[PDB]
Amino acid sequence: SGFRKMAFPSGKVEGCMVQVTCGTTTLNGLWLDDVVYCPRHVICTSEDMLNPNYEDLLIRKSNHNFLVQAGNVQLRVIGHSMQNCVLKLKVDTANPKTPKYKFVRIQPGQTFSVLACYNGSPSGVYQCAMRPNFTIKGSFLNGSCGSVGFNIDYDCVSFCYMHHMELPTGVHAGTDLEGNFYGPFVDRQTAQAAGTDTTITVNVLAWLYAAVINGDRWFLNRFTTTLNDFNLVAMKYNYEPLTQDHVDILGPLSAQTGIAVLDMCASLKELLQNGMNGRTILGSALLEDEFTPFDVVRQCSGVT
Amino acid sequence: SGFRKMAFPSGKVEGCMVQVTCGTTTLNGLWLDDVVYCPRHVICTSEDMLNPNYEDLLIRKSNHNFLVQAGNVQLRVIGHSMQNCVLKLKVDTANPKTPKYKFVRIQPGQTFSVLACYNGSPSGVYQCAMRPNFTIKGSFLNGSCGSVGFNIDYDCVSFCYMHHMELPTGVHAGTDLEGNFYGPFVDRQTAQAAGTDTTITVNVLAWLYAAVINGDRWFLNRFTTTLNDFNLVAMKYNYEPLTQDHVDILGPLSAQTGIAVLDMCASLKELLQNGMNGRTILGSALLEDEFTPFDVVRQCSGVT
Ligand SMILES: Cc1ccncc1NC(=O)C1(c2cccc(Cl)c2)CC1
Ligand SMILES: Cc1ccncc1NC(=O)C1(c2cccc(Cl)c2)CC1
């Protein structure tokens, strides 16, 4: 039936995007109820970004300095406050398009959709994973700050990410919706170390199960392994160590395919040690890790 | 800044999806104005699909046999007609969420977003290309028929695809919104030949320009080629022959990067003849062809 890097339908989030302008700077905001959320660096100029004192910069700002526009209508700002690295602008009107929502802080290795926006207008949607080093490999340009990451369960949107910064390496950093950065990052124009990244082992295994379900079975072999033997291979190839918690999460996929998790680990071990020999798996020439076991179950069952 | 396989924001299309049921069969429909569009095979049972006489099957059906539901509200069907492989159900209510739209028949090699749906409810969104052989490599299960492909320009949705069928090979076939199949396919449960597919050369080149813009430059070399010399390599590797029309379309990317199109062809020639030697380009270990030159310009400039 096929397998694609699928994002959630973005409609519920599109109806929340607004443009926030403070003096010279314009970025995106998320309008939920009567609050607009945006990166606090909207109050900076390029000269400030080198080492900003956000508290002092925000003191020079009043409610009337924040211009919030939803499509073409201007919102009236009646309160402003800084929570960690986000600003919360109280407006006099609740968003009539506010979906059922939650703010969640996702774990590294989990996936989410990003609705990239410019001037409060959506441009596109893509699926990605929060890397084990708390960076994301997105697609963002100047003006995209304030774009958010989310998951959708039934009718409830769980916002997990707000885009803030591009590291000098081209990878992306941002916060949860409480303004706490994922990783060691600070909202400052300084060179910042992103830790060593690893491949999300449980996600690669989940994707190997997706491949078997969709017919790509060439990599299945006559071997098995143990968690300890497999983890010696995972360490050499910079893969996250596999735990029984990971094996347990792969249980639904093992029950459906009839392939024991450690037998799939032995396929992955051989792929790590021998490569793909010029072959592909689900249209990829590398081991894909941005699909969780839940994503595989969801896509392979047709959950809406 | 990064480069991702980005889909259009699906909100405008989500508001058009409905569930259509005819007797035992349920699939998705697209509600635009007072017409609901869906695959005509909604009128078949499994016994009919082997060799259906759609004209005769549709004669046994009246307006009241088509159950159309938009979320939780029932639409009143007042007319029904078959146009090629699609049914058009006239309803007594115009969709209040109908966006500015057009029906377009896209060309092979062009890209579009798919909003996969089940029971009239969206599950996800992904970007894909209409293959040169008029198939699409999507992600669809039973119940996904009627899901549509589209492009968005400013505020206008151009619907180009309606999903109808999975070939025994696992690839997908469907129609334009006038119900004309792309390719030689017929809506019948018979083994059907999809032609030999080729790699979309102009899209690979566009993606190589996207890689240079985003820093991946290892593949650039000290060589050049000619259209005729390059096309001898394209034929051997099952790539579409490059024409001056393709070179002309790559003009904006050549002007921005300062790399002449034939110099980029020489990089592609060497990649075809030598492989990637275990290296990657924009996170891929293979040559990607599902990004048009327009897609690259759009993503790299931030068009909303
Ligand atoms: C230009 C760009 C591209 C992609 N994503 C984001 C950006 N923007 C940035 O990085 C900016 C910045 C600078 C330093 C630290 C922080 Cl928190 C933010 C706004 C200028
Ligand atoms: C089951 C499925 C999976 C993915 N995409 C689509 C489907 N559905 C089909 O192919 C069906 C069919 C059969 C033969 C010809 C035609 Cl036009 C349609 C409905 C049963």
Q: Enumerate the domain spans of chain B.
A: 1-14+100-197, 15-99, 198-301
Decide: helix, strand or coil at residue A49: coil
The CA angle A233-A294-A122, to the nearest 5 degrees, is 110
CA of A11, closest CA in chain B: separation in Å? Answer: 4
Cα–Cα distances in Å, from A199 out to A105, A183, B153? 20, 17, 37
Q: B114: which strand partners?
A: B126, B149
Catalytic one of B38, B145, B160, B265? B145
Nearest CB neighbour to A302, from listed B12, B143, B171? B143
B282-288 contacts: CB < 8 A, separation 24 or more? B282/B3, B282/B207, B282/B210, B282/B211, B282/B214, B282/B216, B283/A137, B284/A284, B284/A285, B284/A286, B285/A276, B285/A284, B285/A285, B285/A286, B286/A280, B286/A284, B286/A285, B287/B199, B287/B204, B287/B207, B288/B203, B288/B204, B288/B207
Residues constituting chain B: 304
Residue B299 to residue A170, Cβ atoms within 8 A: no
Q: Distance of alpha carbon A262 from its chain centroid, rounded?
A: 29
Decide: helix, strand or coil at residue A249: helix
Judge contact between B19 and B75, C-beta under 8 A. Answer: no
The CA angle A119-A123-A125, to the nearest 5 degrees, is 130
Q: B83: which strand partners?
A: B86
**CATH number among 3.60.21.10, 3.40.30.10, 3.40.50.300, 1.10.1840.10, domain B198-301:** 1.10.1840.10
For chain B, positions 156-195, list CB contacts with chain A under 8 A.
166, 170-172
Pick from A135, A148, A137, A150: nearest CA to A104: A150
Q: A261-274 and A201-213 are packed helices; what angle lies between their axes, rounded to 10 degrees? A: 100
User: In degrees rounded to 5, what are phi and psi of residue A229?
Assistant: -65, -45
Residue A128 contacts B, CB cutoff 8 Å? yes
Q: Distance of alpha carbon A122 from its chain centroid, rounded?
A: 17
Question: Same CATH fold, A15-99 and A1-14+100-197?
Answer: yes
CA of A284, closest CA in chain B: separation in Å? Answer: 7
Residue type at A233?
Answer: V
CA of B211, closest CA in chain A: separation in Å? Answer: 12
Decide: helix, strand or coil at residue A228: helix
Q: A227-236 and A261-274 are packed helices; what angle lies between their axes, rounded to 10 degrees? A: 30
Q: What is the DSSP letter of B60?
A: T
C-alpha to C-alpha distance for A275 and A194, rounded to whole angstroms: 27
C-alpha to C-alpha distance for A304 and B122, rounded to whole angstroms: 6
CA of B280, closest CA in chain A: separation in Å? Answer: 9
Q: What is the DSSP letter of A64?
A: G
Residue B275 contacts A, CB cutoff 8 Å? yes
C-alpha to C-alpha distance for B304 and B57, rounded to whole angstroms: 45
Catalytic one of A128, A145, A160, A265? A145
Nearest CB neighbour to A125, from listed B1, B6, B141? B6
- Residue ID of nearest Cα to ligand 1 atom 11: A165
C-alpha to C-alpha distance for B167 and B185, rounded to whole angstroms: 9
Q: What is the DSSP letter of A177?
A: T
Instruction: Say whether A41 is catalytic.
Output: yes
Pick from B144, B133, B132: nearest CA to B38: B144
Give the determination technique.
Answer: X-ray
Atom nearest to A27 CA in ligand 1: 19
CB contacts, 8 Å: A283 with chain B: 137
Residue B170 to residue A283, Cβ atoms within 8 A: no
User: What is B15-99's CATH number?
Assistant: 2.40.10.10
Cα diameter, chain B: 69
Give the side-chain half-sphere CA count within 13 A for A184.
8
Residues constituting chain A: 304
User: In degrees rounded to 5, what are phi and psi of residue B240?
Assistant: -65, 140
A105 contact partners, CB below 8 Å, separation of at least 6: A160, A176, A178, A180, A182
- Residue ID of nearest Cα to ligand 1 atom 9: A165
**Residue A58, both tokens:** 């925000």
Neighbouring CB atoms inside 10 A of A160's CB total 25
* B274-287 residues labelled b (16+ CB within 10 A) or e (exposed): eeeeeeebbebbbb
C-alpha to C-alpha distance for A12 and A125, rounded to whole angstroms: 12
Catalytic one of A41, A80, A172, A246? A41
Residue A69 contacts B, CB cutoff 8 Å? no
Resolution attained, angstroms: 1.6
Atom nearest to B140 CA in ligand 2: 4
Q: Distance of alpha carbon A231 from its chain centroid, rounded?
A: 26
User: In degrees rounded to 5, what are phi and psi of residue A287?
Assistant: -80, 115
**Residue B177, both tokens:** 């919104």
| CATH class of the domain whose range is B1-14+100-197 | mainly beta
Residue A4 to residue B138, Cβ atoms within 8 A: yes
C-alpha to C-alpha distance for A304 and B118, rounded to whole angstroms: 7
Neighbouring CB atoms inside 10 A of A58's CB total 18
Atom nearest to A140 CA in ligand 1: 4
Neighbouring CB atoms inside 10 A of A77's CB total 19
A23 contact partners, CB below 8 Å, separation of at least 6: A43, A45, A65
**DSSP strands (E only) in chain A:** 17-22, 25-32, 35-39, 66-70, 73-75, 77-83, 86-91, 100-103, 111-118, 121-129, 148-153, 156-166, 172-175
Cα–Cα distances in Å, from A101 out to A13, A81, A89, B86, B200? 10, 21, 18, 37, 41
Q: Kindly tell me the burial class for residue A137, based on how many C-beta atoms sit within 10 Å of its own C-beta (0-12, 13-18, 19 or more).
A: middle
B226 contact partners, CB below 8 Å, separation of at least 6: B262
Pick from B173, B126, B161, B115: nearest CA to A304: B115
Residue A125 to residue B10, Cβ atoms within 8 A: yes
User: In degrees rounded to 5, what are phi and psi of residue B211?
Assistant: -65, -50
CB contacts, 8 Å: A276 with chain B: 285
A212 contact partners, CB below 8 Å, separation of at least 6: A220, A257, A259
A28 lines ligand 1 (CB under 6 A): no
CB contacts, 8 Å: A144 with chain B: 302
Find the residue in B nearest to A143 (Cα): B302
Q: How far is the CA of A184 from the centre of ligand 1 (A)?
A: 16
For chain B, positions 276-295, list CB contacts with chain A under 8 A.
276, 278, 280, 283-286
